[PDB]
Design a protein around this ligand. Structure first.
Ligand SMILES: [Zn+2]
Length: 240
């Protein structure tokens, strides 16, 4: 049980920053105003896949479509561990799985098994092979009612305008140092873990906008200097 994992957002509410994206998805889920495809854009580390998964969670919670998924039903618990059957996770950026991808994209499992929606989460989507695009391109045109597409990319422009014009796009932003620092302090207090001021500042300046890496580092700092988050440990982990 490490901070990076233990502090994974369980609801839109737990997310730091991105006010506009959270409001649009929360309200959207709360209003039954749901689109066919969503496009999450931003630099690596802004939480693009983290927010898309919370969306899938909210979309499939057994209690119903909601912005505040219960987190205790099987869909929620499984979706949270990326072991859900209606949440097909794809990595277009890796050649290790190019085989199954192209397949799944035609093999659009048109009908959920246990969830009310079948969800495809495609990370680094602009990297899909000429093949996966075209089928994907074809589906966004004529979209199955119980199927949704959650796309993530660090490079929106590299996508055809035919996919761009068919997706509601969410522009995730990097956090300033204070938002990261404040969260870090709040986390360590809840955890009853000691921390020096400059130490958290070094950790936040270091994170470079990402709260996900802000946490890994803190963990890789709580590990170095044994016990607490002491300034020497931190600048020592930032090492040499
Ligand atoms: Zn649930």
């Amino acid at each position: 049980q490490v901070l990076a994992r233990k502090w994974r957002p369980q609801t839109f509410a737990d997310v730091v920053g991105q006010e506009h994206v959270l409001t649009a998805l929360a309200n959207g889920l709360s209003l039954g105003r749901i689109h066919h495809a969503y496009l999450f854009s931003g630099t690596r580390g802004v939480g693009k896949t983290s927010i898309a998964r919370l969306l899938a969670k909210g979309l499939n919670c057994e209690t119903g479509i909601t912005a505040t998924p219960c987190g205790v039903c099987d869909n929620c618990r499984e979706i949270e561990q990326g072991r859900f059957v209606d949440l097909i996770e794809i990595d277009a950026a890796s050649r290790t799985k190019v085989e199954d991808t192209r397949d799944l994209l035609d093999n659009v499992q048109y009908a959920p098994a246990r969830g009310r929606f079948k969800v495809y989460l495609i990370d680094e989507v602009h990297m899909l092979s000429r093949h996966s695009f075209n089928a994907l391109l074809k589906t966004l045109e004529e979209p199955p009612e119980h199927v949704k597409f959650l796309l993530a990319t660090t490079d929106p422009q590299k996508l055809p305008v035919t996919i761009l014009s068919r997706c509601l796009q969410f522009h995730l932003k990097a956090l300033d140092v204070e938002q990261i620092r404040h969260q870090l302090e709040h986390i360590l207090n809840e955890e009853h873990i000691a921390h020096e001021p400059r130490a958290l500042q070094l950790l936040a300046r270091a994170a470079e906008g990402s709260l996900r890496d802000a946490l890994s580092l803190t963990d890789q700092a709580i590990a170095s200097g044994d016990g607490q988050v002491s300034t020497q440990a931190v600048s020592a982990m930032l090492g040499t």
